[PDB]
Amino acid sequence: QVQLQESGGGLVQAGGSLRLSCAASGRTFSLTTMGWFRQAPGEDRAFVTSISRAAYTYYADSVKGRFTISRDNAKNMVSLQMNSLKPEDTAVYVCAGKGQGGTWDYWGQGTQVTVSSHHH
Amino acid sequence: QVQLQESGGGLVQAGGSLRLSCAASGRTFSLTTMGWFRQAPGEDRAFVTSISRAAYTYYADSVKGRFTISRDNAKNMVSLQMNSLKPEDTAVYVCAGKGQGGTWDYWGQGTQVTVSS
Amino acid sequence: RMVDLPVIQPRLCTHARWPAPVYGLLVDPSLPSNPQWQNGRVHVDGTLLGTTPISGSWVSCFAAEAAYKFQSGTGEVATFTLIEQDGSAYVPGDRAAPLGYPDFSGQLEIEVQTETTKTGDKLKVTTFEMILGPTTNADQAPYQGRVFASVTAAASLDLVDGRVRAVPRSIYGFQDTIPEYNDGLLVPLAPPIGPFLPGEVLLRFRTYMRQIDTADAAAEAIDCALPQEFVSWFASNAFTVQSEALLLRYRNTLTGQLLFECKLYNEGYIALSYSGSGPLTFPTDGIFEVVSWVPRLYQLASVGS
Amino acid sequence: RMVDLPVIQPRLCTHARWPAPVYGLLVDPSLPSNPQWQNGRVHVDGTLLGTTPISGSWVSCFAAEAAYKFQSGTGEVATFTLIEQDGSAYVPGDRAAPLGYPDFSGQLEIEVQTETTKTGDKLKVTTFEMILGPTTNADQAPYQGRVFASVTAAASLDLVDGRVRAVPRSIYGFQDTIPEYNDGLLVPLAPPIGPFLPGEVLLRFRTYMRQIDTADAAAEAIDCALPQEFVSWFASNAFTVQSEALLLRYRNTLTGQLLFECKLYNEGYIALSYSGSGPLTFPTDGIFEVVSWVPRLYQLASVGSL
């Protein structure tokens, strides 16, 4: 019905930056808001950011001023620019979408982000 | 608004027949079911018959088997064939329309039918 | 325009026969095959059928001019002269009752409140028992605009006659069959749900009523043919009918994996091809997609093939 | 296709902020101009805003796991660990609370019943009073998924527990301002309704709550921006947004008389041009029609201009 496909992710040192993107395909008129959740092992998904068809954005307090989400409505595509990455940002990041009932209904496959620290 | 214009009416002998019609104009997108009510002097207005967009009919028990309603959706038009008329059928017959909400929202002008004995 | 449906999961919808969320989606060949439900009934052409209202808040409710009279060894007896729930005059017509009137049987607990017209209106709330009938001793006539309820009382409750609204609270002795609409006489009804092709059965949207007994309460299933969001959707649209039914697919919302194909007949009920003898429940987090107009004789794939 | 609206009269609709019929349609320039309602909010592009649910049955309700404790300074309470009303996990996100959670203040009487899952589930019911307001109570944080209430009526010494559904019954000390959602921390909200041109005022769809004061109950008005059937209509469509606003006309169903022209702004609120000091009510038996896409600066005729 709606498939979400993530790009990007991987390993970075603390203070570094990564860009994630997500493309939706299928019956995309049932896809409203798009966003990102993240999950650590043994934990539930936690909200990171969303962006509405009208480009209205919300961010979790922990990522404000470091992460930026953008969207291309025509391509059903969002991007997340993650700057000033912290160890605690290490998680599987999962592209998400709301359906017409305003519920989070669609998940990508998830992409590992690892923010490594070296104890010099 | 929806204007419902009745045609026909008049005097007929008991046991005789008469045909009424009603045509809708105005905001007819908002019109669903069409029908007929009647009212004698000093009695309450009373349902006679209705016909839906899908041609599903209802009749009051007092007219079942005597009156037949039909509809032309392209003209927003109903016809009422009144057979085996009785003196107690004497009344003003008014065309009526439901809106999308299922309420009777629309009244015609009324046409007198008189059945003599 | 081609017919389409809202892309709304059943579990996010409102029930069309009892004013609660939809909790279940199922077929169950043990239940009556062709029920004569009067609420939750709409034609795909946009015509509300039976007593079905647009608003979910009207379902299993009524509005009335109330007159109360004390009866020794009963309590307060309410005579309710019905009006439509928008305060407009009720006239006996081509449906069994005012819009949204209950379409099932048993003893309904109703909460009756003074009509609300402006801030500062003084309100009195009283709970009554309403026997919906049919019973050998029930003289309900909602078709004529006249119903009765009672509340056990040792003395007068000093109730005030006037306009009221009644909402449902619980059921006792629920039976899913039409109430007494007209004093034991015939009344205009939406026809039974159906007919079905051989091997087709009704798809049911389920919620639960609070059913009481002396010292206990328990959930009791009630089914409807469509959620109230599909009722209001068809009534809001004026789709051009092109054939006798709509072929739908019920799909997993993420994966798009097909759970079943079904037929939405124009007269507002969904059929699946299912010949099991036991109930078959479905996940309530799928969505219905309109595939095409199809004739009455279109043969569905069996559920599981 | 062009945006259109259902041809349904307001008096046949469901309210979007209290679960009752729409009774009234008005403007009132004396009231707060830019309310920050979280229910009854939808974008014309089909996005539900704030905590708005698609179902009217979810409005001013909640679902939870219920348990009991002594609370410091307060006494015996129930705690409610919130769940979405379909039983799906509540995750703090881009809105202030679970879908349909109350968006006003006051002391709300709630009736809490055991979750219904199947025929024969035994049900308990308990009544509670829940303080929605400028609370600074760590137990009152619907954004984080926890609230509490006091017991006010019980059928027996065996109170409701475990998975439950809460429905609103009555209000005391109603104030139409948002509750404290996140224990005095920032919370994601739909923005205030607005802006309006000079001379433009919000169209209100009105219902009545049962407001109690120890002995006597009275009706109390609560407004919303759109009826629930208009909320579900926009959410069920994926309309193309061609401009800032839609010009609508509201007409008498029976006579066709124009009652007013108005602007439906993209963010899902309607404006009339009206400059009286106090409320002007309109018939609830009229119809809306879509005229045209227009710019934000489109100047409306004043109500009753000829």
The DSSP line for B35-65 is EEEEE-TTS--EEEEEE-TT--EEE-TTTTT
Contact C48 B32 (CB under 8 A): yes
Q: Do D123 and D208 reside in the same domain of the chain? A: no
Q: What is the token pair recorded at A88? A: 């605690």
CB contact B97 to C (< 8 Å): no
Contacts of C281 (CB under 8 A, 6+ apart): C24, C25, C26
Question: In this complex, do C52 and B102 lie within 8 Å of one another by their Cβ atoms?
Answer: yes
Find where tokens 């930056």 sit. Answer: A17
Residues D177 and D35 grouped into a single domain? yes
C73: Cβ–Cβ under 8 A, 6 or more apart, which residues?
Answer: none
Question: What region, left, alpha or beta, does residue A28 occupy, with left being phi > 0 and alpha being psi -120 to 50 degrees?
Answer: alpha
Question: Same structural domain for residues D23 and D106?
Answer: no
* Of A10, A25, A17, A1, residue with least CA distance to A93: A10
The DSSP call for residue A98 is E
| Closest approach of A101 to chain D, Cα-based (Å) | 6
Contact A74/D at CB under 8 A:
no
- Give the residue on B whose Cα is nearest the Cα of C243: B54
In CATH, what number is assigned to the domain containing residue C249?
2.40.510.10
Q: Does A52 touch chain D (CB under 8 A)?
A: yes
* Chains C & D: contacts with CB separation below 8 Å: 145
Residue D305 lies inside a defined structural domain of this protein: no
| Residue A2 CB partners (closer than 8 Å, separation 6+) | A24, A25, A26, A27, A28, A30, A31, A97, A99, A105, A106, C253, C254
CA distance B100 to chain D (A): 6
Structure tokens at B104: 């009777």
Report d(CA D16, CA D28) in Å as an integer. 19
Q: Which of C17, C26, C35 is nearest to C195 (CA)?
A: C35
DSSP annotation of A82: E
Please tell me whether residues D46 and D94 are part of one structural domain.
no
Q: How many angstroms separate the CA atoms of B78 and B95, rounded?
A: 9
Across-strand partners of B78? B22, B71
Q: What CA–CA distance (Å, rounded) separates A50 from C156?
A: 60
Residue C1 falls inside a structural domain: no
Give chain C's end-to-end CA distance (angstroms, integer): 32
**H, E, C per residue of chain C:** CCCCCCCCCHHHCECCCCCCECCEEEECCCCCCCCCCCCCCECCCCCECCCCCCCHHHCCCEEEEEEEEEECCCEEEEEEEEECCCCCCCCCCCCCCCCCCCCCEEEEEEEEEECCCCCCCEECEEEEEEECCCCCCCCCEHHHCEEEEEECCCCCCCCCCEEEEEEEEEEEEEECCCCCCCCCCCCCCCCCCCCCCCCEEECEEEEEEEEECCCCEEEEEEEECCCHHHHHHHHHCCCCCCCCEEEEEEEECCCCCEEEEEEEECCCCEEEECCCCCCEECCCCEEEEEEEEECCCCCCCECCC
Pair C116, C123: CB distance under 8 Å: yes
In angstroms, the separation between the Cα of residue B3 and the nearest Cα of chain D is: 9
The DSSP bridge pattern shows strands D125-132 and D146-154 to be: antiparallel
Q: Which of A97, A59, A56, A52 is nearest to A73 (CA)?
A: A52
Query: Could you tell me if C36 and C177 lie in one domain?
Result: yes
Residue C211 one-letter amino acid: Q
| Pick from C47, C86, C93: CB nearest B53 | C47
**Alpha-carbon distances, residue A61 vs A21, A58, A69, D153, D293 (angstroms):** 21, 9, 14, 40, 37
- Look at residue C15 and tell me if it is in a domain: yes
Q: Are C204 and C222 in contact (CB under 8 A)?
A: no
Task: Please give, one letter per residue, the 3-state secondary structure of chain D.
Answer: CCCCCCCCCHHHCECCCCCCECCEEEECCCCCCCCCCCCCCECCCCCECCCCCCCHHHCCCEEEEEEEEEECCCEEEEEEEEECCCCCCCCCCCCCCCCCCCCCEEEEEEEEEECCCCCCCECCEEEEEEEECCCCCCCCEHHHCEEEEEEEEECCCCCCCEEEEEEEEEEEEEECCCCCCCCCCCCCCCCCCCCCCCCEEECEEEEEEEEEECCEEEEEEEEECCCHHHHHHHHHCCCCCCCCEEEEEEEECCCCCEEEEEEEECCCCEEEECCCCCCEEECCCEEEEEEEEECCCCCCCECCCC
Q: In sequence order, what are the residues at sequence separation of 6 or more whose Cβ sits closer than 8 angstroms to the Cβ of residue A68? A: A80, A81, A83
Distance from the Cα of C254 to chain A's closest Cα (Å) equals: 5
One-letter amino acid for residue D66 of the chain: A
Nearest-CA distance C69 → chain A (Å): 47
B31/C166 Cα distance (integer angstroms) = 29
Task: Tell me how far apart the alpha carbons of residues D87 and C284 are, in angstroms, rounded to a whole number.
Answer: 11
Whether the CB of B32 is below 8 Å from some CB of chain D: the reply is no
Check the CA dihedral B22-B23-B27-B32 and report its sign: positive
What is the Cα–Cα distance from C106 to C174, expressed in whole angstroms?
Answer: 5
Amino acid identity of residue A33, one-letter, is: T
> How many interchain CB pairs under 8 A, A with D?
58
Distance CA D178, CA D134 (A): 9
CA of C208 vs chain D CAs: smallest distance (Å): 6
Give domain status of residue D4, yes or no: no
Enumerate neighbours of D (3 or more CB pairs within 8 A).
A, B, C
What b/e sequence results for C245-275 when a residue is b if at least 16 CB atoms lie within 10 Å of its CB, and e otherwise?
bbbbbbbebbebeeebbbbbbbbbbbbbbbe
Nearest one of D249, D152, D127, D140 to D184, comparing CA atoms: D140
- Co-location of C82 and C162 in the same domain: yes
C241/B54 CB distance under 8 A: yes
Asked if D6's CB is within 8 angstroms of C220's CB, the reply is no
Nearest-Cα residue of chain A relative to residue D96: A58
Q: Which residues does a chain break follow in chain C (C to N more than 2.5 Å)?
A: none
Q: Do chains C and B touch (3 or more CB pairs under 8 A)?
A: yes
Q: What are the b/e assignments for D216-247, b being 16+ CB within 10 Å?
A: ebbbbbbbbbbbbbbbbbbbbbbbeeeeebbb
Q: Which of D38, D39, D94 to mutate to test the interface with A (most CBs of A within 10 A)?
A: D94
Strand partners, C12: none
Q: Concatenate the DSSP letters of all residues of A6-64 into one string.
A: EEE-EEEETT--EEEEEEEEESGGG---EEEEEE-TTS--EEEEEE-TT--EEE-GGGT
**DSSP β-bridge partners for residue D166:** D62, D112
CB distance from B106 to chain D under 8 Å? yes
Domain boundary among D172, D197, D218: D172
Residue D240 and residue D199 in one domain: yes
Token pair of C275 as six digits? 């010949």
* Domain shared by C17 and C48, yes or no: yes
Let me know if residue D181 belongs to a domain: yes
Judge contact between D245 and C152, C-beta under 8 A. no
Any CB–CB contact under 8 A between B65 and chain C?
no
Q: How far apart are CA C280 and CA C27, in angstroms?
A: 5
**Interface-testing mutation among C11, C287, C289, C290, with chain A (most A C-beta atoms within 10 A):** C287
Among the partner residues B1, B29, B101, nearest to D255 by beta-carbon distance: B1
d(CA A82, CA A69): 9
The Cα of C118 is separated from the nearest Cα of chain D by a number of Å equal to: 7
Residues of A in contact with D186 (CB under 8 A): 61
On whether the CB atoms of residues A118 and A13 are closer than 8 A, the answer is yes
| Cβ pair D58, C8 in contact under 8 A | no
Determine the residue of chain D that is closest to B27 in CA distance. D256
Experimental technique for the deposited model = X-ray
For residue B84, what are the contacts with CB-CB under 8 A and spacing of at least 6?
A: B15, B17, B66
Tokens 């299993």: give the residue. C60
D163 and D76 both lie in a single domain: yes
The C-alpha of B4 sits at a distance from chain C's nearest C-alpha, in angstroms, of 18
CA atoms within a 13 Å half-sphere pointing along the CA-CB vector of B90: 12
Q: How many domains does chain C have?
A: 2
User: Long-range contact list for B38-47, CB < 8 A, 24+ apart?
Assistant: B38/B89, B38/B91, B38/B92, B38/B93, B38/B94, B38/B113, B39/B91, B39/B92, B39/B94, B40/B90, B40/B91, B40/B92, B43/B91, B45/B94, B45/C91, B46/C92, B47/C91, B47/C92, B47/C93, B47/C94
| Angle in degrees, 0-180, between the axes of helices D228-236 and C228-236, rounded to the nearest 10 | 80
* DSSP type of residue A108: -
Please enumerate in sequence order all residues whose Cβ is within 8 A of that of D41, keeping only pairs 6 or more positions apart, or say none.
D48, D49, D50, D52, D190, D225, D231, D268
Check CB contact under 8 Å for A29 and C7.
yes
CATH number of D150's domain: 2.40.30.120
Asked, for residue D302, whether it belongs to a domain, the answer is no
Chains B and A touch (3+ CB pairs under 8 A): no
Q: Which of C126, C147, C172 is the last residue of a domain?
A: C172
Task: Give the Cα separation of D173 and D131 in Å (integer).
Answer: 10
- The phi, psi pair for C259, rounded to 5°, reads -90, -45
Q: What is the dihedral of CA C176, C178, C183, C187, to 10 degrees?
A: -170
Do residue D130 and residue D257 come from a single domain? no
Of A28, A31, A116, A113, which is closest to residue A67 (Cα–Cα)?
Answer: A113
SS3 B105: strand
**Closest partner CB to D287 (pick from B30, B103, B106):** B30
Tokens describing residue C237: 């649209």
What would the two tokens of residue D195 be?
């802006």
Q: Is B50 on the interface with C (CB under 8 A)?
A: yes
| Structural contact between residues C129 and C109, judged by C-beta atoms closer than 8 angstroms | yes
What single-letter DSSP state applies at residue A87?
A: G
C-alpha pair distances (Å), C54 with each of C14, C117, D53, D285: 12, 21, 18, 14
Question: Per CB distance under 8 Å, which residues of C are interface residues toward B?
Answer: 43, 45-48, 52-54, 84, 86, 88, 91-94, 99, 186, 188, 235-236, 238, 241, 266-267
Q: Which residues of C touch D219 (CB under 8 A)?
A: 116-121, 123
Query: Of D172, D200, D217, which closes a domain?
Result: D172
Q: How many CB pairs under 8 A join B and D?
A: 27
Which chains share 3+ C-beta pairs under 8 angstroms with C?
Answer: A, B, D
Measured CA to CA, the distance from residue C150 to residue C172 in angstroms comes to: 14
Residues of D in contact with A52 (CB under 8 A): 43, 47
Domain that holds residue D204: 9-58+173-295
Tokens of D106: 């006051």
Contacts of A31 in chain C (CB under 8 A): none
D279 and D199 share a domain? yes
Identify residue B99 by its one-letter amino acid code: G
C-alpha closest to that of C204 among C50, C31, C39: C31
Residue C301 lies in a domain: no
C252 and C212 fall within a common domain: yes
User: Would you put residue D190 in left (φ > 0), alpha (ψ -120 to 50) or beta?
Assistant: beta
Domain membership of residue C78 (yes or no) is yes
Partner-chain residue, chosen from B35, B61, B103, that has the shortest CB–CB distance to C94: B35
Ramachandran angles phi, psi of D103, nearest 5°:
-120, 25
